Structure 1
């Protein structure tokens, strides 16, 4: 497993999140559930807890966007980069942004929202990329994971326990 340089991490155990806007690609309900399921994967193996906000600034702000959207890293249209998340800390830190030029599905063939969201939150909690082929944090996880058999690897679990306990 790998962490980000200097090992940034959250200094409280109770975190909040807000879903700012929605993709045209799926129904609202389908989006809420992909996101709640992604957060539960990580809540099971750490002493952190998550709660939702509908107004104000939450620790993790989630939003959908295309091309330039307010930071140093512009989206690139269809394919290539699919999303991007920042390491723990104030302001933009911890936030996750999804490229709306991709086609978000609930399918096992295509760009799955739940899968990508579980990987990006890993970044938001403090983990970088792994070299273990079975890991949720290996760079090619989106092509290699069988959603019928989904599970965090031992490497994922080892990595998150070294930061949070």
Structure 2
């Protein structure tokens, strides 16, 4: 347990900012009871599959002010997981973008070139950016804030079983909608029901909540 805590608090930025004080920062950030203790609710939280983007701080120094300055956003589906038919993957990403296009002045268009603003990639372990995935479960995906090159891109851990219904695996639609939020410039939310909360929860309800819309509206 203390080894899991050490790795979680390190990976997601709490240890850098700071086990008590770092656990307090995590409990505040995740809206858990703020005991300062490695207790059952905190351990359950740490064992919950979630987004690979850090909570406090950032992957790295990025370029620019971290939002898009044009409105026709392009995305490239660089490769495909074998877990779902191509057309089902295409439609999952299209629906995830449709969530954000309704609440922003942005449009999203699928392109077939590396030139895209948002390059979407499936990969496993170390997949080319120095931020390796971790095998099945754990972190499910990550993305990078708007800007040039890797910025704006969205990566999905193909050691996960990608699905869409209730049942085994993880909803590619829900995780993509979350990661696309980062690709548009959002940080994680501390509201457990919000789309931009970092933990994965399956739902058949509408993914966007007030906090997500408030955040994207603030930017655009």
The TM-score, its normalising length taken from structure 1, stands at 0.90
Among 121, 135, 146, the alignment partner of 1:63 is 121
Q: Is residue 17–residue 61 contact of structure 1 (8 Å, CA) maintained in 2?
A: yes
Kindly indicate whether residue 174 of structure 2 is the aligned counterpart of residue 115 of structure 1. Answer: yes
Q: Partner of 1:146 in structure 2?
A: 203
Q: Partner of 1:94 in structure 2?
A: 152
Residue correspondence of structure 1 range 70-81 to structure 2 within 5 A: 70-81=128-139
Provide closer, same or farther for how the CA distance between residues 56 and 75 of structure 1 changes in structure 2, counting only shifts above 3 A.
closer
Q: Partner of 2:217 in structure 1?
A: 161
Q: Partner of 1:10 in structure 2?
A: 68
Distance in 1 (alpha carbons) for counterparts of 2:183 and 2:158:
20
User: Over aligned residue pairs, what C-alpha RMSD do you find?
Assistant: 1.9
Among 110, 120, 125, the alignment partner of 2:184 is 125
Q: Is residue 15–residue 49 contact of structure 1 (8 Å, CA) maintained in 2?
A: yes
Larger RCO, structures 1/2 (Cα 8 Å, 6+ apart): 1
Gapped regions of structure 2 (runs ≥ 5): 1-54, 59-63
Q: Is residue 72–residue 108 contact of structure 2 (8 Å, CA) maintained in 1?
A: yes
Q: Is residue 64–residue 98 contact of structure 1 (8 Å, CA) maintained in 2?
A: yes
Distance in 2 (alpha carbons) for counterparts of 1:151 and 1:56:
29
DSSP 3-state at the match of 1:157: helix
Provide closer, same or farther for how the CA distance between residues 67 and 22 of structure 1 changes in structure 2, counting only shifts above 3 A.
same
Query: Post-superposition shift, 1:104?
Result: 0.4
Gapped regions of structure 1 (runs ≥ 5): none
CA-to-aligned-CA distance 1:72-95 (integer Å, 9 cap, x gap): 201111111110100000000000
Deviation beyond 4 Å, 4+ runs, structure 1 = 4-7
Q: How many residues align?
A: 160
Q: Which has the larger radius of gyration?
A: 2
Larger fraction in helix:
2
Provide closer, same or farther for how the CA distance between residues 96 and 146 of structure 1 changes in structure 2, counting only shifts above 3 A.
same
